[PDB]
């Protein structure tokens, strides 16, 4: 019908649009030698006591980018069991908070077939929950990642344009050399719709796609030959030791650093690092080794990648680039010293009692799809 046309370099102009024929071209045609290697560490799913101390151990206020600012990560947060005081504190420390739905609905077919309204309830609803119970008023919750990385055809992106989300990070790009840079959705995707029965958008949408390049899981990138890539780090099932993880990180860093310097995505679930102390040790060791030996590698949020694409800065220019210095090295105190611990209930989650921690007063019932504020109000007809 109204299929989005292939990239038209003349109609797609920075900073509101970026594309190339195959997605490998550097924004602003900076040469690769001069592009800061951006790394986006992300954490999925819910934030609470299962992982709050893990994040403190990683983001300890001593690991600094070459601009002297704390390294930054992005959290795609799902609602259930989340501690919204901790979300608020993570945001205060300068990490990005993005939405990963209210329900994390088990059924992969629901996401691939959901209506525009369904996507809004899950994603715009989750934004409402974060903005209220984490008291975030600056409109910085702008990203979306769908549970199980199930893309929602055009409906997901229609929803996101209507709801004024900045970017999506659900679409996977197959293992490619060179890997792909982010792209906007005004023009046709520069790669195949990848994954089992995925339903990808086909029309124009005013949405950034922080594409998820599959990583190369091969233990010997020369001799071994064909193995499918993996998007989530913890879904590379052959990574069993700290050493394998360490080499895996070096190999895929080199794939990006020695080619087009496309942002390197390291997407995790909090448990995979916590439940395997060998993986956490190799990860921290690798981060420290990369930070010490590189003055041209930046650990940044997803929003911060987009801000660079909108105004590309050389490695030399990067150290005074203002968007990358927002909340540089935050100390101060939490928004509240002892959060309320709300023991809450809802007809929408029948039977369960769920603790929601927040610096706000406890709401009347547990926030869910049909009542994201937890106010118990009767909606109008
Ligand atoms: C929820 O998260 C908050 C924020 O990290 C935790 O708050 C800490 O609570 C202790 C003891 O109540 C206080 O002494 C600290 O000042 C709080 N820290 C911050 C940064 O606010 C809280 O313990 C968490 N609760 C649960 C159940 O996960
Ligand atoms: C949100 O934070 C601001 C700034 O600290 C504070 O003035 C306000 O009371 C908070 N809002 C709520 C509802 O607690
Ligand atoms: Zn998830």
Numbering used by the authors: 162 to 542
Task: Quote the paper.
Carbohydrate esterase 4 family (CE4)2 chitin deacetylases (CDAs, EC 3.5.1.41) catalyze the removal of acetyl groups from chitin to form chitosan, a polymer of β-(1,4)-linked d-glucosamine residues. CDAs are widely distributed in protists, diatoms, bacteria, fungi, nematodes, and insects, playing vital roles in chitinous matrix formation and modification, as well as in biological attack of fungal pathogens. In this study, two CDAs from Bombyx mori, BmCDA1 and BmCDA8, were crystallized and resolved, providing the first insight into the structural characteristics, activity profiles, and deacetylation mode of insect CDAs. The structures revealed that insect CDAs possess several unique structural features that distinguish them from other known CE4 enzymes.
